[PDB]
Each structure stands twice: as C-alpha cells, then as structure tokens.
Amino acid sequence: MICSVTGKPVKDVLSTFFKDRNDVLESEVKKFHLLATFEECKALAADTARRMNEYYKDVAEPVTLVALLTGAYLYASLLTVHLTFPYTLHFVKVSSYKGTRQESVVFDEEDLKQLKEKREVVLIDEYVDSGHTIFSIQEQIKHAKICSCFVKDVDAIKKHSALADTKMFYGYTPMPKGSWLIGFGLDDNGLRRGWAHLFDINLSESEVTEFRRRLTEHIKGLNINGVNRY
Amino acid sequence: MICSVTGKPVKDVLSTFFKDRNDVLESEVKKFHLLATFEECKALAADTARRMNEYYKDVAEPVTLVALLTGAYLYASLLTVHLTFPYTLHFVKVSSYKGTRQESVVFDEEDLKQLKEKREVVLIDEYVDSGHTIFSIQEQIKHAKICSCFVKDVDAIKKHSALADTKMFYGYTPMPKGSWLIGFGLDDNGLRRGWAHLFDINLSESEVTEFRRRLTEHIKGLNINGVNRY
C-alpha cells in the first residue's frame, strides 16, 4: 500500500491525484485501481533504458527507434531521455486487422519499407498484451527488436518459435490476467491518457493488492542510481 | 550559474549529463550550450498546463489535442500528465511543402477532416519558430489554438492579422536571435532528441548567459506549486 519509489502511501498518492479534477466524477473515482504509480513506472523505464544503454554502448550507426501511436508517447518520453547511445526516433500509425484466421498489424507501406532497411530497429510500445501484434510485426520485419514498459506474459510470447530469437527490452512482466489498463498514456475510451499512474479497472482488490506486492518488491531491488542524470 | 528550479550549479548539471555518454565525443561536448535545464522546461510545461486547466475547467466535451510529430512528443508528455480536464490526444505527421510563394503544412486528408469538426482543437508543439507553420495551420483550421513550450518571438506571430485572434498557450518567449535548438525532443540532425535539457548550438557564451538571466527571472516568479500531483 506504499509507493516503492517515494514511500508515499498509495491512498495519499491518490488523494493528491484526485483532488478537484475536472475529468472524472467523484462517484467514478472508486472505479480506478492503481497498479503502478507514475514514479514506479519511471523507475521501470529508467531500468529499461539502463539495459538498452549497455546493449548499444558500442553501436557504430544510430539505432532506429520507432514508437507506435498513440499510447506509447509517454513511455517513449520516459525512456528516451535516459538513453545514451545514438538513435533516431519517429512515430508511426498502424492498424490491427482482425481476419478470420489471424490478426495482423498493418503498417503504412512507406514506413514498413523504411524500417526493413535498418539493421537495428526497435519498436516501442508501452504495453505488449496479446502479443499478436509482435508476432505480426516480427513476420513483417524479421530483425525487429521490441521495447515495452509492461509485458503481460513473456513465455506466451516465447512460445512462438519465430519469436524465440526476438530481442525484447521491457520494464516489467507479467501483468494480471483479466485486467484492463488505462493511464500511463493508455486511453480510457479516448480519455485520460495523461493520468500518469497506471490504473486497472477490471481486477478485484485482492488481485490489485497481489500485483502491487510483487511489483514493489521488484522495484525495491533495482539498481538504477545514476541512470537519471536530470 | 544555477538551475532556477533545483538550485544546483549548471556546471554540475552539465557534468552529470555528460559523464560517460556514448552519443557525443568529448571534443563535441563544448558545442552544446545549455539554455534551459530539463527541470526548468518541466516548470514551464507545468505552467502551461495550469493555464490550460483554468481555461478548460468547465469544458462540456473533450478537447481535441493534436501534437506535431516528431519533436512535440516530449513536451506533450510533460504537458498532458498535468491536465485535469477531458481531452483526446493524437499525433499528426504533417509535411512542410516549400512552394515558390509560400511554405504550407500538409495534413493527412482524414486528419484534417476530423479536426475541422471539433470546436476545441489545440495544436501542441515544443517550439514555434518561423511560425509559417501556424499561419498555414490556422488558414486550414482557423479555430485551432496553439500550445508551445517555447516561442521564438510571440510579437512576430501576431503581425499576421489572421493570427491576431488565434489563442496561444505558451511557456516562454523570446528565444535568442540566431539560436538553433536541439534536445527537449528536438533533433540535432536526427539525433539527440532525448537529450532532455534544451541546448543551443549557435550562440556565444555571453548570448547564452544573457538568455539564462531572463529565463531565470521568469521561472523564479512562477507559481506552479501543486500543479504536479506525482
């Protein structure tokens, strides 16, 4: 029940967050369950930057970082400010086409053509849930690497022999089955992307309490002193 | 000599920033002149959020926020997390077409069609410089408002009778004549967007020192205590 970065009790984090807002009704406040405080998410992002920094410290050509619109903008902002190797960054819009046999990610033709030419390409997304997206991206850009703050189930991802070699830089895994996330850039039917804390709206209290028990323990064990230079 | 937010000597903010990086050569470090630390930029962004919160405190429908790729991603992340009224957010990758008579901003047809329907549209940019972009945007989306962390010369934009009514939310102005900004989301020929401090690469030390004198005076007078709930 306490922020693992600041030590502030979650009830106090939330009382501050919900004070006199104009984007939520008092009666709706209880529907939002905090899974991770913004500070905790920032720590995860910094830890991910640390690993990417070690991975690319000797790179001889700028890495191509590409973020998928629109939710990844926040995570991308929290990650990129801590990167210390050369890279270019751009955002692309994709579509999720649900076919009778599979769900495929549709890229703009030019965006796809460009990405396939780069040796080091890292696609950023704040949340890898079903993974159908990365299975599809991987088959279109075989050498693509993935970067995401949260990954629901890496093993599930690893199950696919095609994704077995795919390098993923992520902040934390696993995420709760049955959850529905909003905040931390993720929209609530278009709204609340700027609600910086990561909230869930579908889990039970015990599930949220258990997720946080595991998350705080993970964050308390991090060694990211110095990653943040600001 | 110090960060107007943290109180820490700029020399140390810079030493911490440049220690063991893999994205700049030692001989190149001196090319970057700090104009505003990341914390100072965050204060300016918090100030713009405060003003937008007051402006839209009673809005009856979600405000349409549109951020201009790529550079605006960082500022948008620093702005949106502090907004307390309802809004949707999306990014557009417009083109800057240089014609023989004028430079126009080319929007995707669908993006432009959608925006023209919303009563409240706010274009987000981390830096409004030549303004040619906003003269063009307002003639395509006349009711569009602008939100930019930094503005080269507000007095100049107003010159255009068409832009005279265009509401602008901005963090700070004016920027030094002849400056070229990199960092804070802005690229240095594609690189260093994640260098979170705002740097200039064209000015003399005396020019930079004078700018910081003015920026400091402005930030010391800011009243944003409480805008940040995180």
Cβ contact, residue pair B77, A82, below 8 Å: no
Reference B17, options B4, B29, B5; nearest CA is B29
d(CA A201, CA B79): 24
Which residues is A127 bridged to in the sheet?
Answer: A150
Helix, coil or strand: residue A35: strand
Give the one of B37, B81, B86 whose C-beta lies nearest to A191's C-beta. B86
Strand order through the sheet with B87-92:
B87-92, B63-68, B121-128, B145-151, B168-172
Helix, coil or strand: residue B188: strand
d(CA A63, CA A150): 22
d(CA A151, CA A130): 9
Reference B228, options B30, B39, B32; nearest CA is B39
d(CA B56, CA B168): 14
Residue B77: list chain A partners with CB under 8 A. 73-74, 76-78, 185
Cβ contact, residue pair A70, B59, below 8 Å: no
Cβ contact, residue pair B91, A81, below 8 Å: no
Read off the tokens for A158.
Answer: 């690893």
Minimal CA separation from B25 to chain A, in Å: 11
Please return the burial class of B116, using the count of CB atoms within 10 Å of its CB with bins 0-12, 13-18 and 19+. middle
Give the one of B81, B84, B89 whose C-beta lies nearest to A23's C-beta. B84
d(CA A203, CA A86): 40
Please return the burial class of B194, using the count of CB atoms within 10 Å of its CB with bins 0-12, 13-18 and 19+. buried
What is the amino acid identity at position B74?
L
Within chain B, residue ranges assigned H as helices are 10-18, 38-55, 72-80, 109-115, 132-140, 154-157, 205-220
Minimal CA separation from A87 to chain B, in Å: 6
**Binding-site annotation, residues of B for Mg(2+):** 125-126, 187
Cβ contact, residue pair A90, B70, below 8 Å: yes
Minimal CA separation from A154 to chain B, in Å: 27
Cβ contact, residue pair A73, B70, below 8 Å: no
Residue A50: list chain B partners with CB under 8 A. none
Read off the tokens for B177.
Answer: 């004549």
Minimal CA separation from A205 to chain B, in Å: 23
Give the one of A38, A87, A185 whose C-beta lies nearest to B230's C-beta. A38
Cβ contact, residue pair A191, B19, below 8 Å: no
d(CA B126, CA B225): 22
Cβ contact, residue pair B53, A78, below 8 Å: no
Reference A149, options A61, A64, A222, A76; nearest CA is A76
Domain B1-230 has CATH 3.40.50.300: no
Cβ contact, residue pair B74, A80, below 8 Å: yes
Cβ contact, residue pair A191, B88, below 8 Å: yes
d(CA A175, CA A131): 13
d(CA B106, CA B92): 10
Nominal resolution in Å?
1.8
Minimal CA separation from B55 to chain A, in Å: 11
Residue A37: list chain B partners with CB under 8 A. 230
Read off the tokens for A80.
Answer: 């990129």
d(CA B188, CA B123): 23
Please return the burial class of A98, using the count of CB atoms within 10 Å of its CB with bins 0-12, 13-18 and 19+. exposed
Cβ atoms of A40 and A219 closer than 8 Å: yes
d(CA A96, CA A152): 18
Helix, coil or strand: residue A88: strand
Cβ contact, residue pair B91, A80, below 8 Å: no
Please give the backbone phi and psi of residue A175, each rounded to the nearest 5 degrees, phi first. Answer: -115, 155
**Which residues 6+ apart lie within 8 Å of B125 measured at CB?**
B67, B68, B71, B72, B75, B133, B146, B147, B148
Cβ contact, residue pair B194, A37, below 8 Å: no
Interface test with B, best of A17, A42, A81 (most B CBs within 10 A): A81
Minimal CA separation from B227 to chain A, in Å: 10
Cβ contact, residue pair A38, B81, below 8 Å: yes
Q: Is the previous residue joined to B70 through a cis bond, with omega within 30 degrees of 0? A: yes
A177-205 burial, b at 16+ Cβ within 10 Å, e below that, comes to eebebbbbbbbbeebbbbbbbbbbeebee
Give the one of B73, B81, B86 whose C-beta lies nearest to A23's C-beta. B86
Interface test with A, best of B18, B74, B77, B111 (most A CBs within 10 A): B77
Cβ atoms of B212 and B93 closer than 8 Å: no
Residue B61: list chain A partners with CB under 8 A. none
A122-139 burial, b at 16+ Cβ within 10 Å, e below that, comes to bbbbbbbbebebbbbbbe
Cβ atoms of B144 and B122 closer than 8 Å: yes
Other C-beta atoms closer than 10 Å to the C-beta of B207 total 17
Minimal CA separation from A1 to chain B, in Å: 16
Which residues is B169 bridged to in the sheet?
Answer: B147
Cβ atoms of B187 and B201 closer than 8 Å: no
Which residues is A89 bridged to in the sheet?
Answer: A65
The number of helix segments (H) and strand segments (E) in chain A equals 7, 11
* Rg from Cα positions in chain B: 18
Helix, coil or strand: residue B11: helix
